[PDB]
Amino acid sequence: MILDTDYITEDGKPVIRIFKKENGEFKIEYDRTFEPYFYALLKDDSAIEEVKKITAERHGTVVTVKRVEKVQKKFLGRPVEVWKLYFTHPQDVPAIRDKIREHPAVIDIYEYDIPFAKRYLIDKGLVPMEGDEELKMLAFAIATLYHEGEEFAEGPILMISYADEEGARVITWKNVDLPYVDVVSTEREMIKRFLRVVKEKDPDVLITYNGDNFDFAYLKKRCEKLGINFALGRDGSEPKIQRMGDRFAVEVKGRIHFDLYPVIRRTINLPTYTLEAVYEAVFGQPKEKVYAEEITTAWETGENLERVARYSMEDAKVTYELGKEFLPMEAQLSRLIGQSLWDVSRSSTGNLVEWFLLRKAYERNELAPNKPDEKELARRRQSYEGGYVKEPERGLWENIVYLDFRSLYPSIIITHNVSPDTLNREGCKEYDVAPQVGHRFCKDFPGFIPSLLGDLLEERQKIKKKMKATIDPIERKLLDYRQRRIKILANSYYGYYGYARARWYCKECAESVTAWGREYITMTIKEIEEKYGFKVIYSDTDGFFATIPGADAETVKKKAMEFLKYINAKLPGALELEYEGFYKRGFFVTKKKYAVIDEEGKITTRGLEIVRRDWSEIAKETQARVLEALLKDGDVEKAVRIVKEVTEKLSKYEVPPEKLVIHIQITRDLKDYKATGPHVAVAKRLAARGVKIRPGTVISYIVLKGSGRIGDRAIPFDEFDPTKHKYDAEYYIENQVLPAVERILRAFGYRKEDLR
DNA sequence: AATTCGCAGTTCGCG
DNA sequence: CGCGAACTGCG
């Protein structure tokens, strides 16, 4: 199993290291034969010996073109000849590429920004995380001494906890009377003991929660103050702290540093991403938070350190359990994309698609288009029309079916062969023409993307077959993760086409996909209404809700099935309309906001305040209770009574403050805000006290009694003191609870004033 | 740093 | 000074 690749330099030459786990044994394979390269398109082929002779400077060393070679490649499906330029060292490419490009005899250069170690995985056809290897995992966490106003890591680390399959332990340098606590005499001894634990356990994976931006940088700065060689890497190196623009990321050579924090933020939608909230959401069990003020207080007084150590132990324990839950899924992502788990677990959609495509392009001798520079990025600013959204027939409906297309956009891409290499390609026998926008797509050969998509969807079906047939629980589950990752990847191609930073950006492809989607859904709506007598209540992009106004539940179901047989005989290629479900009742509030109830009483909500982090729990819970009384009991009277009891509890200050918290993400640097809403106001005051506020921070605040601007009486919920602060009961009535329920209960004649 | 589609709370500036 | 537009966030 390949874990990662990198390179080191030996006598001026790159040596690739392949880090592997084979038969339970860690191995480093060295490859001295791989040459960095990129491609150049020349106006005339005699110009090569001119550019073959260009040189650059790399702090000290002159940089030469090592050697050149003419190759035949495809570019967007058309044959092309280019010069492959080889170099001695990968750092030669950034030093020289701008000067080779600026040459008047060079039309353009290509594949000039591919990191050497990732280039190696692609060109050698190596796929990380393949095979039957069990990885040894170890989670760790730290507790630090924090004082408001101090610089980062001016205080000592107080405890280091770690956990694996054998249990969890805490190292600390004060006496704590617990069996899982190991006491050493100093902070230096604690770090050194932790280093020895990691060396002795020799894990393949180090799991942290936000270790990229807290734990390792804290450890590093203490190790600098204390004179510790923090040799965590299997090659004896220190953790390598890389700038990723906004934040940092930390590598441990020969291991996989698996930071759960970027993984969870991209995998689950939670109102906040504290370790306690993530653990409770994933496993359903509570985890108690101990705050920095309490930790520092316990350390300086020497009292109740057992509580701090138990919290520290539990941090490591739940980090391990979360690592066990999420690492297998990320390993399948790594195998599918063909890049290291470290990389893919820190990457966004656009990057992941692009790395998959670069590997496929290499496999097919397709030269990669370049990323856009500034002038092209501005040229790609234009938007295009998206999915069709019908204004709902608002209100309460009975006996509804939902019909939707199976994977509408992937079906369109495959059926109509939508790809930048087939777009208006001249000379073909056959074309499909996008409605409205008119783009033509050659059908004579499978386009690059449709071909990859079709392979993906076919592989996913084969995995589902192997899953049901396989006789192995571990294999069955890894297959499940793989088919889920394939679905996400296949569903990512449409948006990637419209992504202005994409190498294979194609706005014509993107808007042809949406145009066909609009044509299929609106034509299907027309057929069901005109030929089958349905009333379409609401429709959004790839599906619609419909009923037969005067009909009973069984009539609606059966005629829906008849329509499906009718319409699917008319739909071309991979387009397929499917029966998604029957809902006894549904309430449609606005576009993209509705709730339905199935025959077993399960309520599904979409777009409603109940799902949003920026609405208080008291409002969300009231909306939920109103929707239960309407959809399940058909009892408007009960729903109104519910609202009146909630508004009465608020005005008597009987609601727990925890149900009044509003969670809102900070999305940018605080000085970049043109306007200051309440969460920005809270964040700015926290940053004034020295608190680290970065994009992605979730501000959790409560609105206090007073008047004027909400932001002027908003405070972090952590600071809420029910003895010195009064929450704004009227604010949570008038701005939270009543707005969330009013738009539902208006359909039955009630105004806000009859609910207070 | 996937897309376009959508709703709505807060703040503020304008007649 | 009530109203709407801008800003903002998150489905």
Author numbering: 1 to 756
Paper text:
Kod-RI is an engineered TNA polymerase that was evolved from a replicative B-family DNA polymerase isolated from the archaeal hyperthermophilic species Thermococcus kodakarensis (Kod). The polymerase harbors the A485R and E664I mutations required for TNA synthesis on DNA templates, as well as the 3′,5′-exonuclease silencing mutations (D141A, E143A) that prevent the removal of newly added TNA residues. Phosphonomethylthreosyl nucleic acid (pTNA, also abbreviated PMT and tPhoNA) is considered a possible XNA candidate for information storage in cellular systems. pTNA is an unusual example of an XNA; it contains modifications in both the sugar and phosphodiester moieties with α-l-threofuranosyl sugars connected by 3′→2′ phosphonomethyl backbone linkages. X-ray crystal structures of the post-catalytic complex showing Kod-RI bound to a DNA substrate that had been extended with either two pTNA adenosine residues (ptA) or two 2′-deoxyadenosine residues (dA) were solved to high resolution.
Our findings indicate that Kod-RI is capable of synthesizing trace amounts of full-length pTNA after 24 h of incubation at 55°C. The nucleotide addition products reside in the enzyme active site of Kod-RI as canonical Watson–Crick base pairs with their complementary thymine bases on the DNA template. Close inspection of the newly added residues failed to identify any differences in the hydrogen bonding pattern of the Watson–Crick base pair even though pTNA does not form a stable duplex with DNA in solution. No signs of duplex destabilization were observed in the pTNA structure, indicating that Kod-RI likely forces pTNA–DNA hybridization by acting as a large molecular clamp to hold the complementary pTNA and DNA strands together. In the Kod-RI structure of the pTNA extended primer, we observe a novel alternative conformation for R606 (labeled R606B) that is not present in the Kod-RI structures solved for the DNA or TNA extended primers. Located on β26 of the thumb subdomain, the positively charged guanidino group of R606B forms a strong ion pair interaction with the negatively charged phosphonate group connecting the newly added ptA12 and ptA13 nucleotides. Other structural differences observed in the polymerase active site include a bridging water interaction between Y594 and the phosphate group linking ptA12 and ptA13 of the pTNA extended structure. Another novel interaction observed in the pTNA extended structure is a weak hydrogen bond between K592 and the O4′ atom on the sugar moiety of ptA13. Additionally, we noticed that the catalytic aspartate D542 was located further away from the terminal pTNA residue than its position in the all-DNA extended structure of Kod-RI, suggesting that the incoming ptNDP substrate may adopt a suboptimal geometry in the enzyme active site. In contrast, the threose ring of pTNA adopts a sugar conformation that is C3′-endo (PptA13 = 37°) and C4′-exo (PptA12 = 47°) in the enzyme active site of Kod-RI.
